[PDB]
Design an enzyme around this catalytic site. Structure first.
Site, mmCIF file in Angstrom:
data_model
loop_
_atom_site.group_PDB
_atom_site.id
_atom_site.type_symbol
_atom_site.label_atom_id
_atom_site.label_comp_id
_atom_site.label_asym_id
_atom_site.label_seq_id
_atom_site.Cartn_x
_atom_site.Cartn_y
_atom_site.Cartn_z
ATOM 1 N N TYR A 110 0.827 -1.204 0.000
ATOM 2 C CA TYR A 110 0.000 0.000 0.000
ATOM 3 C C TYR A 110 0.868 1.263 0.000
ATOM 4 O O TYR A 110 1.786 1.381 0.808
ATOM 5 C CB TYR A 110 -0.844 0.002 1.281
ATOM 6 C CG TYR A 110 -2.289 0.440 1.158
ATOM 7 C CD1 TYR A 110 -3.292 -0.476 0.809
ATOM 8 C CD2 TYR A 110 -2.664 1.757 1.452
ATOM 9 C CE1 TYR A 110 -4.632 -0.096 0.761
ATOM 10 C CE2 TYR A 110 -4.006 2.154 1.405
ATOM 11 C CZ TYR A 110 -4.985 1.222 1.059
ATOM 12 O OH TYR A 110 -6.315 1.606 1.000
ATOM 13 N N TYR A 156 -9.102 3.499 -3.484
ATOM 14 C CA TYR A 156 -9.483 3.958 -4.813
ATOM 15 C C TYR A 156 -10.758 4.793 -4.884
ATOM 16 O O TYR A 156 -10.787 5.819 -5.563
ATOM 17 C CB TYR A 156 -9.621 2.779 -5.772
ATOM 18 C CG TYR A 156 -8.327 2.254 -6.342
ATOM 19 C CD1 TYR A 156 -7.256 3.106 -6.618
ATOM 20 C CD2 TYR A 156 -8.191 0.906 -6.660
ATOM 21 C CE1 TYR A 156 -6.072 2.617 -7.199
ATOM 22 C CE2 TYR A 156 -7.024 0.411 -7.242
ATOM 23 C CZ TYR A 156 -5.970 1.263 -7.505
ATOM 24 O OH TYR A 156 -4.814 0.739 -8.041
ATOM 25 N N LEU A 209 3.154 8.768 -16.121
ATOM 26 C CA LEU A 209 3.978 8.682 -14.913
ATOM 27 C C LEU A 209 4.881 9.916 -14.776
ATOM 28 O O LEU A 209 5.146 10.375 -13.664
ATOM 29 C CB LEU A 209 4.820 7.398 -14.929
ATOM 30 C CG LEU A 209 5.568 6.980 -13.654
ATOM 31 C CD1 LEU A 209 4.630 6.936 -12.455
ATOM 32 C CD2 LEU A 209 6.197 5.618 -13.871
ATOM 33 N N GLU A 232 4.115 12.886 -15.878
ATOM 34 C CA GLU A 232 3.184 13.931 -15.491
ATOM 35 C C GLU A 232 2.770 13.816 -14.032
ATOM 36 O O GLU A 232 2.593 14.827 -13.348
ATOM 37 C CB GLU A 232 1.939 13.870 -16.373
ATOM 38 C CG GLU A 232 2.240 13.717 -17.849
ATOM 39 C CD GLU A 232 0.991 13.779 -18.706
ATOM 40 O OE1 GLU A 232 -0.001 13.081 -18.390
ATOM 41 O OE2 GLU A 232 1.004 14.527 -19.705
ATOM 42 N N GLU A 265 0.220 -2.085 -7.932
ATOM 43 C CA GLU A 265 -0.599 -3.098 -8.583
ATOM 44 C C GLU A 265 0.245 -3.915 -9.544
ATOM 45 O O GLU A 265 -0.070 -5.066 -9.824
ATOM 46 C CB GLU A 265 -1.771 -2.455 -9.325
ATOM 47 C CG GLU A 265 -2.768 -1.755 -8.404
ATOM 48 C CD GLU A 265 -3.563 -2.719 -7.529
ATOM 49 O OE1 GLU A 265 -2.974 -3.642 -6.915
ATOM 50 O OE2 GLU A 265 -4.794 -2.547 -7.441
ATOM 51 N N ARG A 270 2.077 -6.555 -7.607
ATOM 52 C CA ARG A 270 1.171 -7.605 -7.157
ATOM 53 C C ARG A 270 0.768 -8.612 -8.233
ATOM 54 O O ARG A 270 0.495 -9.773 -7.926
ATOM 55 C CB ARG A 270 -0.097 -6.988 -6.575
ATOM 56 C CG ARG A 270 0.097 -6.228 -5.296
ATOM 57 C CD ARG A 270 -1.207 -5.573 -4.945
ATOM 58 N NE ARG A 270 -1.102 -4.647 -3.828
ATOM 59 C CZ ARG A 270 -2.034 -3.746 -3.539
ATOM 60 N NH1 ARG A 270 -3.130 -3.659 -4.292
ATOM 61 N NH2 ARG A 270 -1.877 -2.934 -2.505
ATOM 62 N N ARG A 325 2.439 3.849 -25.612
ATOM 63 C CA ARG A 325 0.996 4.067 -25.545
ATOM 64 C C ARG A 325 0.546 4.688 -24.223
ATOM 65 O O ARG A 325 1.195 4.526 -23.185
ATOM 66 C CB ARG A 325 0.228 2.756 -25.703
ATOM 67 C CG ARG A 325 0.335 2.086 -27.039
ATOM 68 C CD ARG A 325 -0.967 1.367 -27.332
ATOM 69 N NE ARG A 325 -0.817 0.331 -28.348
ATOM 70 C CZ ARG A 325 -0.447 -0.921 -28.087
ATOM 71 N NH1 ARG A 325 -0.193 -1.290 -26.836
ATOM 72 N NH2 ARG A 325 -0.338 -1.807 -29.075
#
Ligand SMILES: *[C@@H]1O[C@H](CO)[C@@H](O[C@@H]2O[C@H](CO)[C@@H](O)[C@H](O)[C@H]2NC(C)=O)[C@H](O)[C@H]1NC(C)=O
Ligand SMILES: *[C@@H]1O[C@H](CO)[C@@H](O[C@@H]2O[C@H](CO)[C@@H](O)[C@H](O)[C@H]2NC(C)=O)[C@H](O)[C@H]1NC(C)=O
Ligand SMILES: OC[C@H]1O[C@@H](O[C@H]2[C@H](O)[C@@H](O)[C@H](O)O[C@@H]2CO)[C@H](O)[C@@H](O)[C@H]1O
Ligand SMILES: OC[C@H]1O[C@@H](O[C@H]2[C@H](O)[C@@H](O)[C@H](O)O[C@@H]2CO)[C@H](O)[C@@H](O)[C@H]1O
EC number: 3.2.2.22
Lengths: 262, 258
Positions: free
Chosen positions: B76, B119, B140, B142, B173, B176, B192
């Protein structure tokens, strides 16, 4: 919180060719055989198994029992208390093997035909000995992406890596409960490996033999392991051009790492 | 001192990204606890605050730098430092509040957000769903600048929250799930910028449920199916652990082995 409490799930047992572990003709008299049979969409207890805490697999109350501890005897349904105690004990491994601890003989199906009687063979991690506890009767269909972002693709009797066309000549693969990887468009064809030699080229032959060179497993480290030989899928000399996927010992570079994209 | 992994979006490449995540996973688990071939994360109860966090430092083309603090028990993102200041998501319990005290002790200014890191709260404040926020190396860079300037006051709250959603997904994430790592890796390979598929959003949401199902399964068999989604949106149910072995990379500790 506490120690883990493993439950006792009721599930079907899908195996060779996507067939289910079935108790012949729905009868439960001590001795009636266990067989491979097309999976059913219903509640017939002769196809649903309860994985007990004591390590016994029970259908409708009876225990999945082996006849003897000799390679070849068949597996029958039986009264759990009557049956020899350690002949009703089984462990289900993460690599789809269901073994009888006491004889080391694995539950097998030496024929992909519907109705074939289950037996206990000597473990050789073959497609004829891979099973999976799931209510899911359908094989999992994905795209296998590997080295340089290219997709695993099959063209008749051959398999190589090439750029991913989200529509191309079937780059979609179906993963069976028996551990075989089958080309979506021709499901009785297996991703096969002739020898267990340090460089044999993987090809596409018929799943007929259900050999130990047609059963693979996706490891946590992103490799695709051939259970029997210990060798992993390897793109020959990090060269997609060569158009050759070989069996090679593990070293972990990018040419041995794959990811199932679903 | 807490371990410090660093990644820069400057010359970011598919390799530097794969090593970064490989390093982040390497620091979260001790490799002592592994179930069904999937590493489990440390148990919170009884974990010395000196091995409770790891620090990820991100830096972009603009030379701006930011340091995220991840909790080792659940991967986290609990806060971050930017310059001489540190900001923490609102702790959801006394124990946690007491722990973030040991993070960024240097800093002159420690602020604690009024909201949590979850979230929902973050998507609400951002004014966007995870599905509309694009991901990639562009996003990322930005996000780092956005996060950095919040300390000097030049980043609106809606954008801070949109930047937290980006970092959390590309770092926490991604560590994980190998599936989500590969997803981010594809966005870098072809330069992309695109929002996460229904497959990614669902895997993110089921992390807690999957951690439980697998750890308290009877020999890889789940007691109840966990439902997931495909890239096209169609759902499918998972009854066994085996199909997840090449998809999950870390599990939050739920219960002790027998
Ligand atoms: C596979 O399907 C069977 C039946 O469709 C499920 O078994 C039922 O499970 C519930 C609760 O676990 C029981 O109350 C019923 O009695 C069972 N049905 C039968 C056979 O009477 C089974 O749970 C499914 N597998 C999983 C784990 O989802
Ligand atoms: C299939 O999975 C089983 C896991 O139970 C493997 O067998 C065990 O492997 C562990 C080490 O990983 C040993 O400690 C045990 O002694 C083994 N046997 C048992 C009964 O636990 C087995 O090796 C795997 N198959 C392959 C070739 O990967
Ligand atoms: O063995 C094949 C198949 O049998 C079904 O049971 C039939 C049985 O074959 C028949 O003799 C009896 O009269 O009716 C039963 C119900 O259709 C099983 O249901 C199936 O699972 C297979 O086991
Ligand atoms: O022999 C297959 C083996 O090739 C290795 O790659 C070699 C290759 O043999 C050749 O190009 C040269 O010798 O160096 C390459 C780099 O090692 C792969 O590394 C290995 O995985 C196998 O694919």
């Amino acid at each position: 919180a506490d120690v883990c409490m493993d439950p006792e799930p009721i599930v079907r047992i899908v195996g060779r060719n996507g067939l289910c572990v079935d108790v012949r003709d729905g009868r439960f008299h001590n001795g009636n055989a266990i067989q491979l049979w097309p999976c059913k969409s219903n509640t017939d207890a002769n196809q649903l198994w309860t994985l007990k805490r004591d390590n016994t697999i029970r259908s409708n109350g009876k225990c999945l029992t082996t006849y003897g501890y000799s390679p070849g005897v068949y597996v029958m349904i039986y009264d759990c208390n009557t049956a020899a105690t350690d002949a009703t004990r089984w462990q289900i491994w993460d690599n789809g093997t269901i073994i009888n601890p006491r004889s080391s003989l694995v539950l097998a199906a030496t024929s992909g035909n519907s109705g074939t009687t289950l037996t206990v063979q000597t473990n050789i991690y073959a497609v004829s000995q891979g099973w999976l506890p799931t209510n899911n009767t359908q094989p999992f269909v994905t795209t296998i992406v590997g080295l340089y972002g290219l997709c695993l693709q099959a063209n008749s009797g051959q398999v190589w890596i090439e750029d991913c066309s989200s529509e191309k000549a079937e780059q979609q693969w179906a993963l069976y409960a028996d551990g075989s990887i089958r080309p979506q468009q021709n499901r009785d064809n297996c991703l096969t490996s002739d020898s267990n030699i340090r460089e044999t080229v993987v090809k596409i032959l018929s799943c007929g033999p259900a050999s130990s060179g047609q059963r693979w497993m996706f490891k946590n480290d992103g490799t695709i392991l051939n259970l029997y030989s210990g060798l992993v899928l390897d793109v020959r000399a990090s060269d997609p051009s060569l158009k050759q996927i070989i069996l090679y010992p593990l070293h972990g570079d990018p040419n041995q790492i794959w990811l199932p994209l679903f | 001192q807490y371990p410090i992994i660093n990644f820069t979006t400057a010359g970011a490449t598919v390799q530097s990204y794969t090593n970064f995540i490989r390093a982040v996973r390497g620091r979260l688990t001790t490799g002592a606890d592994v179930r069904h071939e999937i590493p489990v994360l440390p148990n919170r109860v009884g974990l010395p605050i000196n091995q409770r966090f790891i620090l990820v430092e991100l830096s972009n083309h603009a030379e701006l730098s930011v340091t995220l603090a991840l909790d080792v028990t659940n991967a986290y993102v609990v806060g971050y430092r930017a310059g001489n200041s540190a900001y923490f998501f609102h702790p959801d319990n006394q124990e946690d509040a007491e722990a973030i005290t040991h993070l960024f002790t240097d800093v002159q200014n420690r602020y604690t957000f009024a909201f949590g890191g979850n979230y929902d709260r973050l998507e609400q404040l951002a004014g966007n769903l995870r599905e509309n926020i694009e991901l990639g190396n562009g996003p990322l860079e930005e996000a780092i600048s956005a996060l950095y300037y919040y300390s000097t006051g030049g980043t609106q709250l809606p954008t801070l929250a949109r930047s937290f959603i980006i970092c959390i997904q590309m770092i926490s994430e991604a560590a994980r799930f190998q599936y989500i790592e590969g997803e981010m890796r594809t966005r870098i390979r072809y330069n992309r910028r695109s929002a996460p598929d229904p497959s990614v959003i669902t895997l993110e949401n089921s992390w807690g449920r999957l951690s439980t199902a697998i750890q308290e399964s009877n020999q890889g068999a789940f007691a109840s199916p966990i439902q997931l989604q495909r890239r096209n949106g169609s759902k499918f149910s998972v009854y066994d652990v085996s199909i997840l072995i090449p998809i999950i990379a870390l599990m939050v500790y739920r219960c002790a082995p027998p």
